[PDB]
Design a protein around this motif. Structure first.
Motif, PDB file in Angstrom:
ATOM      1  N   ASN A  62      31.573  34.641  52.999  1.00  0.00           N
ATOM      2  CA  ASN A  62      30.471  35.057  52.167  1.00  0.00           C
ATOM      3  C   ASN A  62      30.718  34.063  50.707  1.00  0.00           C
ATOM      4  OD1 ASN A  62      28.684  36.985  53.496  1.00  0.00           O
ATOM      5  ND2 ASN A  62      30.400  38.265  53.324  1.00  0.00           N
ATOM      6  N   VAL A  63      29.620  33.644  50.076  1.00  0.00           N
ATOM      7  CA  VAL A  63      29.532  33.219  48.861  1.00  0.00           C
ATOM      8  C   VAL A  63      28.883  33.893  48.136  1.00  0.00           C
ATOM      9  CG1 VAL A  63      27.737  31.541  49.212  1.00  0.00           C
ATOM     10  CG2 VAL A  63      29.270  31.317  47.133  1.00  0.00           C
ATOM     11  N   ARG A  64      29.224  34.522  46.878  1.00  0.00           N
ATOM     12  CA  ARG A  64      28.544  35.459  45.904  1.00  0.00           C
ATOM     13  C   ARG A  64      28.307  34.786  44.657  1.00  0.00           C
ATOM     14  NH1 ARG A  64      27.350  40.676  47.133  1.00  0.00           N
ATOM     15  NH2 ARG A  64      28.155  41.601  49.178  1.00  0.00           N
ATOM     16  N   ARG A  65      27.565  35.201  43.900  1.00  0.00           N
ATOM     17  CA  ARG A  65      27.190  34.686  42.572  1.00  0.00           C
ATOM     18  C   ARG A  65      26.957  35.894  41.770  1.00  0.00           C
ATOM     19  NH1 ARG A  65      25.873  30.337  39.510  1.00  0.00           N
ATOM     20  NH2 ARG A  65      25.088  30.883  37.509  1.00  0.00           N
ATOM     21  N   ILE A  66      28.033  36.031  40.749  1.00  0.00           N
ATOM     22  CA  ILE A  66      27.708  37.489  39.924  1.00  0.00           C
ATOM     23  C   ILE A  66      26.846  37.156  38.483  1.00  0.00           C
ATOM     24  CG2 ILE A  66      28.887  39.258  38.580  1.00  0.00           C
ATOM     25  CD1 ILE A  66      30.838  39.086  40.762  1.00  0.00           C
ATOM     26  N   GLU A  67      25.947  37.829  38.483  1.00  0.00           N
ATOM     27  CA  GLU A  67      24.974  37.691  37.026  1.00  0.00           C
ATOM     28  C   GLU A  67      24.838  39.030  36.224  1.00  0.00           C
ATOM     29  OE1 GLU A  67      21.389  35.689  37.417  1.00  0.00           O
ATOM     30  OE2 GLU A  67      22.221  33.752  38.542  1.00  0.00           O
ATOM     31  N   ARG A  68      25.068  38.986  34.977  1.00  0.00           N
ATOM     32  CA  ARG A  68      24.875  39.990  34.243  1.00  0.00           C
ATOM     33  C   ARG A  68      23.650  39.632  33.367  1.00  0.00           C
ATOM     34  N   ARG A  69      22.513  40.717  33.329  1.00  0.00           N
ATOM     35  CA  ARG A  69      21.542  40.305  32.788  1.00  0.00           C
ATOM     36  C   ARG A  69      21.153  41.574  31.690  1.00  0.00           C
ATOM     37  NH1 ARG A  69      17.639  38.381  37.663  1.00  0.00           N
ATOM     38  NH2 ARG A  69      19.108  36.696  38.372  1.00  0.00           N
ATOM     39  N   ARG A  70      20.103  41.467  30.908  1.00  0.00           N
ATOM     40  CA  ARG A  70      19.760  42.338  30.033  1.00  0.00           C
ATOM     41  C   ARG A  70      19.747  43.819  30.556  1.00  0.00           C
ATOM     42  N   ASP A  71      19.020  43.961  31.563  1.00  0.00           N
ATOM     43  CA  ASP A  71      18.707  45.254  32.252  1.00  0.00           C
ATOM     44  C   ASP A  71      19.239  45.396  33.618  1.00  0.00           C
ATOM     45  OD1 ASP A  71      17.183  43.781  33.681  1.00  0.00           O
ATOM     46  OD2 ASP A  71      15.267  45.059  33.516  1.00  0.00           O
ATOM     47  N   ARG A  72      20.087  44.517  33.872  1.00  0.00           N
ATOM     48  CA  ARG A  72      20.474  44.705  35.474  1.00  0.00           C
ATOM     49  C   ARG A  72      21.827  43.886  35.548  1.00  0.00           C
ATOM     50  NH1 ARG A  72      15.137  43.561  38.550  1.00  0.00           N
ATOM     51  NH2 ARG A  72      14.453  44.472  36.361  1.00  0.00           N
ATOM     52  N   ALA A  96      37.909  45.525  55.166  1.00  0.00           N
ATOM     53  CA  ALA A  96      38.820  44.638  54.341  1.00  0.00           C
ATOM     54  C   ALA A  96      38.228  43.601  53.200  1.00  0.00           C
ATOM     55  CB  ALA A  96      39.529  43.509  55.215  1.00  0.00           C
ATOM     56  N   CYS A  97      38.634  43.080  52.445  1.00  0.00           N
ATOM     57  CA  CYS A  97      38.062  42.019  51.644  1.00  0.00           C
ATOM     58  C   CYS A  97      39.083  41.153  50.908  1.00  0.00           C
ATOM     59  CB  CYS A  97      37.178  42.976  50.504  1.00  0.00           C
ATOM     60  SG  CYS A  97      36.589  41.610  49.300  1.00  0.00           S
ATOM     61  N   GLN A  98      38.988  40.007  50.757  1.00  0.00           N
ATOM     62  CA  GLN A  98      39.857  39.054  50.430  1.00  0.00           C
ATOM     63  C   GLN A  98      38.931  37.897  49.675  1.00  0.00           C
ATOM     64  OE1 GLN A  98      42.636  37.209  52.877  1.00  0.00           O
ATOM     65  NE2 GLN A  98      42.513  38.843  54.355  1.00  0.00           N
ATOM     66  N   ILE A  99      39.322  37.897  48.456  1.00  0.00           N
ATOM     67  CA  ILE A  99      38.740  36.829  47.614  1.00  0.00           C
ATOM     68  C   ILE A  99      39.484  35.568  48.074  1.00  0.00           C
ATOM     69  CG2 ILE A  99      37.920  35.907  45.578  1.00  0.00           C
ATOM     70  CD1 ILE A  99      36.788  38.184  46.499  1.00  0.00           C
ATOM     71  N   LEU A 100      38.956  34.454  48.680  1.00  0.00           N
ATOM     72  CA  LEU A 100      39.562  33.414  49.177  1.00  0.00           C
ATOM     73  C   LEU A 100      39.584  32.263  47.941  1.00  0.00           C
ATOM     74  CD1 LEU A 100      37.758  32.916  52.326  1.00  0.00           C
ATOM     75  CD2 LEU A 100      40.125  33.751  52.125  1.00  0.00           C
ATOM     76  N   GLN A 101      38.460  32.206  47.144  1.00  0.00           N
ATOM     77  CA  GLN A 101      38.256  31.119  46.191  1.00  0.00           C
ATOM     78  C   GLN A 101      37.367  31.304  45.170  1.00  0.00           C
ATOM     79  OE1 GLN A 101      37.600  27.397  48.209  1.00  0.00           O
ATOM     80  NE2 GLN A 101      37.020  26.325  46.321  1.00  0.00           N
ATOM     81  N   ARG A 102      37.574  30.967  43.827  1.00  0.00           N
ATOM     82  CA  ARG A 102      36.559  31.110  42.803  1.00  0.00           C
ATOM     83  C   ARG A 102      36.210  29.528  42.355  1.00  0.00           C
ATOM     84  NH1 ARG A 102      40.128  35.870  40.351  1.00  0.00           N
ATOM     85  NH2 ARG A 102      39.034  37.490  41.715  1.00  0.00           N
TER      86      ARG A 102
END
Length: 214
Positions: A119-129, A86-92
């Motif tokens: 869990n807290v997660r940080r999503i980052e888009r970078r030039r090569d990853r 299971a996975c539920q996003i609680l908060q952004r």
């Protein structure tokens, strides 16, 4: 931002810094196990959180596809990834910090019972990853309960690395530091985590194939 929102933001940035540090130390990863698909699991010793597992898999699709399927669609991943119950996003917070509730399936053989996590997660888009880096946190909507052992992740994440030379392939990395609690000996937990990493890779491969057939 509230103080709580600011703490979540910091936690995601801190987890991202550790992921970056681990990726920059690849020469120091210690081989642990591989399988017949060439999936490779390593370990690295990290301060405070100690021993951290690393899965590295080469996949025959563009990095963007894996970013979409794993990093941007964690709730949908439940449907095709049998290691995720299971996975539920609680908060952004902002566009790139998310707080989630996650449930991991019991070990393929039943020795290790399912755990749940906040869990807290940080999503980052970078030039090569692309990175989704995270760590355990608390959230009042999901206290520990008797339904599951409440595990606790240390710093880790999902990373998709773009190929400079061949846009049709990419590299998937899962950095996994976790404490499943309970009283089983550590070596059995470690066996179960490696096995889970290979199973994750198997479902991801199958998902990429299914999407490429349509």
């Amino acid at each position: 931002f509230s103080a709580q929102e600011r703490e979540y933001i910091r936690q995601g940035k801190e987890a991202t810094a550790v992921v970056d540090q681990i990726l920059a130390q690849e020469e120091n990863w210690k081989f642990e196990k591989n399988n017949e698909y060439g999936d490779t699991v390593y370990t690295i010793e990290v301060p405070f959180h100690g021993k951290t597992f690393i899965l590295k898999t080469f996949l025959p699709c563009p990095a963007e596809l894996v970013y979409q399927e794993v990093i941007l669609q964690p709730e949908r991943m439940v449907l095709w990834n049998k290691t995720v119950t299971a996975c539920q996003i609680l908060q952004r917070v902002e566009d790139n910090t998310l707080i989630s509730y996650d449930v991991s399936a019991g070990a393929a053989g039943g020795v290790v019972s399912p755990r749940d996590f906040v869990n807290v997660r940080r999503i980052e888009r970078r030039r090569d990853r692309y990175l989704s880096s995270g760590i355990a946190t608390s959230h009042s909507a999901k206290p520990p309960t008797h339904k599951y052992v409440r595990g606790e992740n240390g710093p880790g994440g999902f990373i998709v690395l773009k190929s400079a030379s061949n846009p049709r392939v990419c590299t998937f990395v899962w950095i996994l530091n976790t404490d499943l609690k309970g009283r089983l000996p550590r070596y059995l937990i470690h066996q179960s985590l490696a096995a889970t990493m290979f199973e994750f890779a198997f479902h991801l491969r199958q998902r990429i194939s299914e999407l490429g057939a349509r």
